[model samples]
Target: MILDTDYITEDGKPVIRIFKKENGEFKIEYDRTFEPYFYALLKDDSAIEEVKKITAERHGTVVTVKRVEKVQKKFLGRPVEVWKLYFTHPQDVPAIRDKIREHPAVIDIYEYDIPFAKRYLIDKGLVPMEGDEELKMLAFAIATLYHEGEEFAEGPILMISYADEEGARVITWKNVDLPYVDVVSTEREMIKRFLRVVKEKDPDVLITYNGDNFDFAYLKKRCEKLGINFALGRDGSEPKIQRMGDRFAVEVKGRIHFDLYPVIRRTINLPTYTLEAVYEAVFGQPKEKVYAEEITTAWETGENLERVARYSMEDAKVTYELGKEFLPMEAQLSRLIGQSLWDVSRSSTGNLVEWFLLRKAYERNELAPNKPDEKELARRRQSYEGGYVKEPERGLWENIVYLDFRSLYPSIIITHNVSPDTLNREGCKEYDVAPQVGHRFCKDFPGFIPSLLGDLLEERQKIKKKMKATIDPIERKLLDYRQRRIKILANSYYGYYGYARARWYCKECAESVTAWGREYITMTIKEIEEKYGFKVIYSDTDGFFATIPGADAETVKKKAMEFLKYINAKLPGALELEYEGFYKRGFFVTKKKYAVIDEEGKITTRGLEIVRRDWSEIAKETQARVLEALLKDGDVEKAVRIVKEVTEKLSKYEVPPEKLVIHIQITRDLKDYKATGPHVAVAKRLAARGVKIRPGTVISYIVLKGSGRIGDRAIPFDEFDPTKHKYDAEYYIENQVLPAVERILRAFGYRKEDLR
Candidate 1:
């Protein structure tokens, strides 16, 4: 039998209920008082002895049972029935036991245990909760101590809100919003209020987007000024603040706070992880603008506090949402792989120490323990010693078609069974023939990562095939993004592994991988060139530069597709290459000559006049319109007309007179002196004329042979009166910027206008 508490009616009536298993079924009993519920449990002969035992254990005394009875009564207009038992306490029992016997309906008397009192107090707000302080301390202990022993679940929440011309709004989705309150006070208040709410809610983890560096740090400093102790659970011990580098920190006794800015910056495939950029990429568009000017005005006016609050909430909310989207997968993978997110994020190239630890663990079939002091520090330094590929110089390739092996390195590791242990295998005959450096890959060895990436590439191809046939737009986008990301991951490994400053600082490994990569790339290019009968113009690290003799753009594109198929078959990874785009109807310019390809496929004159400023603008607008048309069926002709209209407007303004004035005011750095743009430049030039002038050093000014008045006086370019000049327009041009140009032109025996 099990007795459970029931809610009291609003009229102040208490109800008691009990459940009992009888004859392979359950029986329920309800009573206005506790008599029948307790009586039912003892009425059964089999339960009688057990009930007495339970009573003795709870009450700390034995009792003699007199009798049991089942009766029915009418209460609250409802019929109720329950068994009743009479019992007498032993004489040795205290007054409490005697008092229980004096009752008319005594069934099984026992002392109350009050098992849920503490929990009930907490749940009902009866207890004084320490809020964040209690939660933080608990979280800290769980992370540093409990998590060290086993895997645990944790995450963060961010809230942001705002008010704009659209009124008060909150961005729970991906979006950027400009909020009011550029002032520190408002920012602090927002954080404080958020913290208060979070404290009340008491989630497992809390995170902020750049909160550690910008938000939390700001609040901490301000709190210090106010003499407020923001410590979570520190009664006597001083809080330990440890720096994790890259502007990251961990508070010893607080929630596991993570800043996403650093994490995104360190990611392999992302371009820019700014809120605005991420919002656009992930959620389509930014809904608000939180610019400096608008925020400052809103705060100063004190008329948009609600708007500011909404904006602030939205900021936190989007951060929370993004974290939700990415962190769970990261957390799961990190736990499964027994590595930190920081380490796993870098593992595309491979983490040698992590590999070593994993190898050791696998050999023994146990979790890897924390490293001893010396070895741990040494492992951390490996990242800095790694080598990176240098930037390829420009003009190295002509007619280059870049053939990128999407997500090459990561895919390689995935496809080739290229784990740390596999790479470090002993007595493996393959290692002798494999391309390797140190304990790393040999030049001839088939790398593990590359092979794994190959498999993912193949899988993505299958997905892409199905996606192409699907009509759903959302499904298409998802598959496309997935395929693209896979390709990028496969290729990103090359850069990550080859990077000198990578965390896994194995130069031999990096070099060996690159050497093999170069061979693969060269072989692929050779096969394409031979098959298509094209001239290999130039080649770079991973891309091929080729020109097909007597072939049109369509022919070249078709050949490129063939090459992609050939490489896809040859590569071990499930990856392929494609023609990104062709630079058609374009020009390659040199000092005195240029090659121009027009829409009609006709080569044109090699002159600067052919590429006029207006023509450049038209070209840009045309390209933009083409993209817009492809994306949204936009009117390309209308866009082109708009560009022309803007150009016409600018051309309608008459050209200003070519009067030249040389105002040479000698000063060190312009910043040290109060001067306008022209004066600032003139001052610096004059100061550095004869001697090396340090910044901030003031110097004198002179007319220096110009068409304008020269003195300590300066005049705005608009207010300058040419009537006060001494030299003609042509003479001024001859003496100033033109003279500088002419000097160089004279060395080549050419006139200024001739070169122009």
Candidate 2:
């Protein structure tokens, strides 16, 4: 299978024609200076005379040769001789073909054979079964490539195949392999056998998880060593696979090698990179952890090879399933957009060039040839530099509650009719626009995005209504989930478009959107305060705070609702304001541990929870409900009851046993410390006996004091003579412990009169 054509001068360079299997019949030219090498390889002799004759006759200097060679070699390193001839071409491919037909060495001289599987499908049925236009086009394209046989044989190859439970099969082959697989001797054999099977039963596309880096690369090296001709398409061509750790791509002869791992990572949002991660994210959970390290170890054992095969098959099956889920529409969109589905999926974080192209596609039905003008680019760049501009010092209102406009910036764009079409309108005003550092927005038609989102919202509402009415649980769940996703998608688009980190949309557009958002919120707050007699306490870009005056909670609730209605009617654009509830029994807690509370009857707002945990739990359940019931429901009693419940649960509890108290004096010097409590009582008794007491600090306490002090002159212990400072054994029992015991009895609610 050879494709050769006449030399043509392009960009002042003499180029010869070549073709690839997937590129169909179209010819691409390469520099023609390398013809001497081609001639030397084709003819064992230099064949310089024949090459010159052909070049002169064709009026061009280059010839391309395409051929399949059958090489034999020692499997384990012994040399074996193998020779084969394929095809050679002059500048003019048609003339070369004619010349080849006349050559005696040429065994088979016909155009490349389209793969059997593809041809079989085309002959059996029309591609693109109805409603499957994308698949149909893919099938047709694959078929066309098979027919125009051009194979390059110098690199690694990947072959992927799978069979579903219902017996349906899909096969694809390419020149790249997976990189993440930890290659071992046994696994290398398995891959070689897999390729052989693919060659025997040619499939549409071979798939793998990270196959370009690991699987196909491993197989190609092994095949090269064994002298196995794995290039099944063209005679001389072999698969070329490039591996760079986690990144890989391949070009193979005769087969389309598809690496499923990159496709999954880039196209879908999975929680993990493993097969199990994809399954769990998409289908809820995998049957088992097939990719675990232990499983790989098990497969290493010869006896456990069956387990390895099963694991490999399951992995292939999951890839097929994921493909089915997204390949039809998503992949087609990706192709139309000149990208992979993964690329399309991250449209929000797309580059400036991509956003510009999308704008062109939406408006002009084509892609923009280049970026925006220098002046416009500078203008867009300026808006994104500073931290997002915010509206300053709107009047502050106590007890102001903010009602956030969902997806406020995006909604603003939709409502205000911002878009390229509008901005580029014949009579529209042109204004200087500034770009944001971390976001992109349309300067010309600022409100177009919000308007588009508005349209989506209307449609979303209809879907929601229908979904709610549907009786089937699964169908209902799916529809509801989609509806919720639509809302999230619309809301997220603003952030996505504005976020500098996003893969789609530019930072300039995001900045522009948020800039307008700041202005809109400020204006909305001002209008509400002026018309409704409410004071706005504080406001961020999307939410506002307003304080209302009323002693009764019902009056406050009524005021909030009325103000919401007033703002909704008075706002100039498509903005709507709603009540976001309120706080009734709230406190302005401080870090000092003490709190000023309204208590049971007072309306004070200051309070503290002595302990942090006590306050947090109370705040968690009480604040919002208390405010809502008091203001909206006009039920003060309900609010009070809720607060009581919280307080009681947090404060009242039994004390634990094994409590000990250590009291020590705080002094600049530790040597000046004193013992206190029961020890002081014993010291006083010793002093009353005219005992000389040292002025040094006391560190120990061996006495227990009960309720009463022994009058001004209390009973002194006579257990030992003060002069001798020695204990008398008989007097010890009659004095010291007995006096301590009597003190404890009187102190524990036993009156001295009763004890006497």
Best prediction by TM-score: 1
User: Which digits, one per residue and each the tens of the lDDT, describe model 2 over residues 408-468?
Assistant: 7656566545433343234445533322222222334434344446666776788799987
lDDT of 1 by residue, 666-733 (tens): 33445566645444554444444433344422222212324443333433232344477322323323
Clashes of each: 64, 78
Local accuracy by lDDT, each model: 0.39, 0.41
Error of 1 at 153 (Å): 34
- Please identify model 2 stretches exceeding 4 Å from their true place: 1-208, 212-246, 250-272, 281-303, 306-310, 321-348, 351-403, 417-510, 522-564, 576-756
State each model's C-alpha RMSD to the native: 23.0, 26.0
Cα misplacement distance, residue 40 of candidate 1 (Å): 67
